[PDB]
């Protein structure tokens, strides 16, 4: 019994304004002396598993990643502390998003005692200070759920596949830090729709978003490659997650070989 219509256009406009303001610095990893895109990929892939173990929302995962990228945009971090940043970020995202955030002792457990409770809580404080408590960031997930409304009737397989593709974008900072969440969501939605039904990004969405199919192309080219190469990627947690029936096992679907485009 959901109702969204009166303020729905305003919300989409507002989120489009805030994604610009909440965007991490695209080039930040070249300025990190000790950490790399590969370490970040390992971290995010682990957070996916943590979210599954604790039955956390997909939104919580997307927020945690936004917090991490913004923190690393202004703070140099040694490789041995990167998991501490990630853990505090996931705790904060859980507190923001979840009805039931896991307790700190559980986050300590899930790192296998790599860090103490004191450290996790001190890191929480630092992340809050560095982000100036601005935690309500737009995510690819928030844009996806709004886009899904343009399918009547809903297609649950398209939605699952779109979420899967959107989640895969979290892992690889290069290329995906270059694109805003609304644009990634648009590429993921189209690619998912096309794969499942053979249809294309709808005019209603082109109007609402201002993105033509053409303007999705560069991101779409990337996402299609990512999709094709997913079974070969060093990080596998998202594929494993989306093999489940709750996701209609969409990670087992074969990508289209070419894009009509």
């Amino acid at each position: 019994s959901n109702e969204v219509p009166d303020y729905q256009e305003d919300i989409h406009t507002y989120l489009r304004e805030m994604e610009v303001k909440c965007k991490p610095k695209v080039g930040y990893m070249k300025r990190q002396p000790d950490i790399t895109n590969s370490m970040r990929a390992i971290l995010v892939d682990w957070l996916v598993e943590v979210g599954e173990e604790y039955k956390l929302q997909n939104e919580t995962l997307h927020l945690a990643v936004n917090y991490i990228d913004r923190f690393l945009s202004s703070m140099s971090v040694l490789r041995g502390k990167l998991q501490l940043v990630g853990t505090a970020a996931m705790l904060l995202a859980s507190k923001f998003e979840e009805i039931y955030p896991p307790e700190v002792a559980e986050f300590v457990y899930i790192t296998d005692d790599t860090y103490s409770k004191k450290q996790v809580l001190r890191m929480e404080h630092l992340v809050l200070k560095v982000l100036a408590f601005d935690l309500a960031a737009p995510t690819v997930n928030q844009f996806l759920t709004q886009y899904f409304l343009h399918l009547q009737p809903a297609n649950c397989k398209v939605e699952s596949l779109a979420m899967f593709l959107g989640e895969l974008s979290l892992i690889d900072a290069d290329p995906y830090l270059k694109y805003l969440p609304s644009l990634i969501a648009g590429a993921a939605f189209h690619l998912a729709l096309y794969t499942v039904t053979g249809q294309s990004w709808p005019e209603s969405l082109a109007q609402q978003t201002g993105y033509t199919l053409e303007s999705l192309k560069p991101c779409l080219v990337d996402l299609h490659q990512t999709y094709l190469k997913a079974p070969q990627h060093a990080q596998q947690s998202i594929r494993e997650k989306y093999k489940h029936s709750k996701y209609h096992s969409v990670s087992l679907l074969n990508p289209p070989e070419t894009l009509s485009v």
């Binding site: 390992i42 971290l43 682990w46 790192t111 296998d112 790599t114």
Partner: peptide, 4 residues
């Protein structure tokens, strides 16, 4: 439980 994993140390990265």
């Amino acid at each position: 439980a994993k140390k990265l």
